[PDB]
Ligand binder design. Structure first.
Ligand code: NI
Length: 374
């Protein structure tokens, strides 16, 4: 049974032989490298602002801001959480345009919006992080620090947008699947977080609780058809029918895709393992068992390699290791966790994406990526 029920989180590092002391030290060190003052992906501005910088693209993305908020609440750092959320509401929240009610996906460090289009994976992380913040610290008096209200309001928009305006929802109401973006009719496998939706089914506005339960089930079934049956690899973008959408080159196993294994691992830990999840993780790990990180490439989902190397091999390592939570007795589970332990956080101008995935894996594998209840 999952941690949602037992309230006990598996410390896979410990179960695989690592000492509690070294695990504690490693988790803290990872956090400090990313959020400490050492030019690191988190930047503090003034006394009430802060943001996570996509060091490589020189911009601030809702993906990173929502990740940062989730990391901060997991680490019990309300000061950091509030700085990020404040920046988000001040510079990213849109009050005008067809996407009013959503958050501009990319902004410049000075706050200027680079687009008025949102990224659904950001919104869903914002919502859960806000629910967790409300549960750990309580809703603040002054907005936008009234966390739970912000979360319910946002999820209301995600489901009902368009009913009273020219906007569109982030979930298709008929198939209950999250969309790549509001105005298209296809998805992105890595955006599916059934474990998040299970919680939304308990904390969102009551009128949408049944919907969220259906979304969780829909996403679990979708992942089954989106992942290649032999390799377990999922495409970055996929049509609702499950097949890859390669219209613009996103139909292969690349950057976005890496998160699928991590998501499957966390869902298994929180809500329980499953035969499909264990088998899926075994497939992915088996595929990479005879491949060296330095040689990781972009692959068609059937395994065929491209000449192009993975742009985020450290992130791939981290996600494959996090996936072990869904197959603790898998033939390659231990090897993946060991590989991750022996892989330092990424350095350089493009440390951002890899390191976000890295910290999430460090938290999950150590039993510190928890559900915070009311
Ligand atoms: Ni030590």
């Amino acid at each position: 049974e999952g941690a949602f029920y037992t309230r006990e989180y598996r410390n896979l590092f410990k179960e695989f032989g690592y000492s509690e002391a070294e695990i504690q030290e490693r988790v803290k060190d990872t956090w400090e490298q990313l959020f400490g003052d050492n030019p690191k992906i988190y930047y503090e501005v003034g006394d009430d602002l802060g943001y996570l910088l996509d060091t490589g693209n020189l911009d601030v993305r809702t993906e990173g801001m929502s990740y940062g908020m989730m990391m901060a609440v997991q680490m019990d750092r309300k000061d950091i959480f509030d700085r990020i959320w404040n920046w988000t509401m001040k510079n990213m929240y849109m009050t005008e345009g067809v996407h009013a009610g959503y958050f501009a996906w990319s902004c410049q460090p000075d706050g200027t919006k680079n687009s008025w289009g949102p990224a659904p994976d950001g919104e869903e992380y914002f919502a859960l992080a806000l629910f967790f913040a409300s549960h750990r610290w309580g809703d603040g008096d002054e907005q936008p620090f009234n966390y739970s209200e912000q979360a319910r309001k946002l999820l209301h928009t995600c489901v009902h947008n368009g009913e009273g305006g020219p906007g569109h929802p982030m979930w298709n109401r008929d198939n209950k699947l999250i969309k790549f973006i509001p105005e298209v009719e296809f998805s992105d496998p890595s955006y599916h977080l059934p474990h998040f939706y299970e919680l939304f089914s308990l904390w969102a506005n009551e009128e949408d609780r049944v919907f969220w339960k259906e979304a969780a089930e829909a996403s679990r079934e979708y992942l089954k058809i989106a992942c290649h049956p032999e390799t377990g690899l999922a495409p970055e973008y996929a049509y609702y029918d499950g097949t890859p959408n390669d219209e613009k080159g996103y139909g292969h196993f690349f950057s976005d895709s890496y998160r699928v294994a991590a998501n499957i691992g966390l869902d298994a830990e929180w809500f329980g393992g499953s035969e499909w999840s264990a088998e899926e993780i075994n497939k992915i790990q088996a595929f990479f068992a005879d491949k060296e990180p330095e040689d990781y490439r972009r692959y068609k989902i059937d395994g065929e390699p491209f000449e192009e190397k993975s742009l985020h091999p450290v992130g791939l390592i981290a996600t494959n290791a996090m996936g072990s939570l869904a197959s603790v007795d898998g033939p390659y589970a231990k090897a993946n966790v060991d590989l991750f332990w022996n892989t330092p956080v990424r350095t350089g101008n493009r440390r951002y994406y890899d390191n976000c995935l890295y910290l999430f894996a460090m938290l999950a594998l150590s039993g510190n990526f928890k559900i915070w209840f009311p």
